Paper text:
GMP synthesis proceeds through two steps, the first being the conversion of IMP to xanthine monophosphate (XMP) catalysed by IMP dehydrogenase followed by GMPS (guanosine 5′-monophosphate synthetase; EC 6.3.5.2) converting XMP to GMP4. GMPS is a class-I (trpG-type) amidotransferase in which the catalytic reaction occurs in two physically distant domains, a GATase (glutamine amidotransferase) domain and an ATPPase (ATP pyrophosphatase) domain5. Hydrolysis of glutamine to glutamate and ammonia occurs in the GATase domain, whereas formation of the intermediate AMP-XMP from ATP and XMP occurs in the ATPPase domain. Ammonia generated in the GATase domain attacks the intermediate to generate GMP.
We purified and crystallized PfGMPS, PfGMPS_C89A and PfGATase, and solved their structures by molecular replacement to resolutions of 3.6, 3.15 and 2.6 Å, respectively. The GATase segment displays an α/β-structure of nine β-strands surrounded by five α-helixes. Compared with Hs- and EcGMPS, the PfGMPS GATase domain exhibits an extension (119–151) inserted between β5 and β6. This unique insertion lacks even in other Plasmodium GMPS and its role is yet to be determined. The structure of the isolated PfGATase domain is similar to those in the full-length PfGMPS_C89A/Gln and PfGMPS wild-type with root mean square deviations (RMSDs) of 0.67 and 1.37 Å. Size-exclusion chromatography shows that in solution PfGATase is largely monomeric while PfATPPase is dimeric, confirming that dimerization is mediated via this latter domain. PfGATase exhibited leaky glutaminase activity, unlike other GMPS characterized to date1116 but similar to PfGMPS. Although PfGATase alone has very-poor affinity for glutamine, the high specific activity values support (as seen in the structure) that the triad and oxyanion hole are positioned in the conformation required for catalysis and the loop movement occurring upon ligand-binding to ATPPase primarily leads to increase in substrate affinity. Interestingly, when superposing the structures of individual GATase domains (PfGATase, PfGMPS_C89A/Gln, PfGMPS) no conformational differences were observed, inferring that the major determinant for an increased glutamine-affinity in the presence of ATP and XMP should be found in the ATPPase domain close to the interface.
Residue numbers in the entry: 6 to 233
Write the structure that this text describes.
Amino acid sequence: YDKILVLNFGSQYFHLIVKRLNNIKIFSETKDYGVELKDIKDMNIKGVILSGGPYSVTEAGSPHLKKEVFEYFLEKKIPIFGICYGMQEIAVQMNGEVKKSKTSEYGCTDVNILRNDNINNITYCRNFGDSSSAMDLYSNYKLMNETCCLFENIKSDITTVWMNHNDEVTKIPENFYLVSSSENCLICSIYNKEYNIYGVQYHPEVYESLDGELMFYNFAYNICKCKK
């Protein structure tokens, strides 16, 4: 089978990730944060999903992915999908920073999908550093010209997602694209082209996220090239 490895960082919504993969007929394998290389060295892994978690990614004792195992995925060209804590784990893993959000988020939230030609859809640019304009705001970040592959076939440039986080990525990891933002989360979703790394601050596995299943289809089939 074309295995999709789902790593557990303690999420209360963890099994929903397995549900999402079941809905699109995808064989999944569940391991924990401390997964060792010998346990997955001989698996047919096409992609890796890092689940959410209630712990603080900067606090001591919190669940982390072994540097050895993370770099194994990159070297083996295995795409990574980070969710909530999983996204923040990616940032910490690749020279990014994570602080406590000035305004935390919970419940249904609209997220703006970012391209270079749709930044003026951000009508809340002064929420972040009191930026004069949207153009001025995203001059500090790198944006794609085409819609990110993860959001392929999403109708609008706005998606309704389920939020649940007190921390946020404040410094984007090395050479990442900024591909989404919300009113209370500037760096809401990231993308690295050379390593095929995708991160989302919200929970696409929760059914409150209307386009969550579409994202799981894109990552599994279009990005990881899995067979049914």
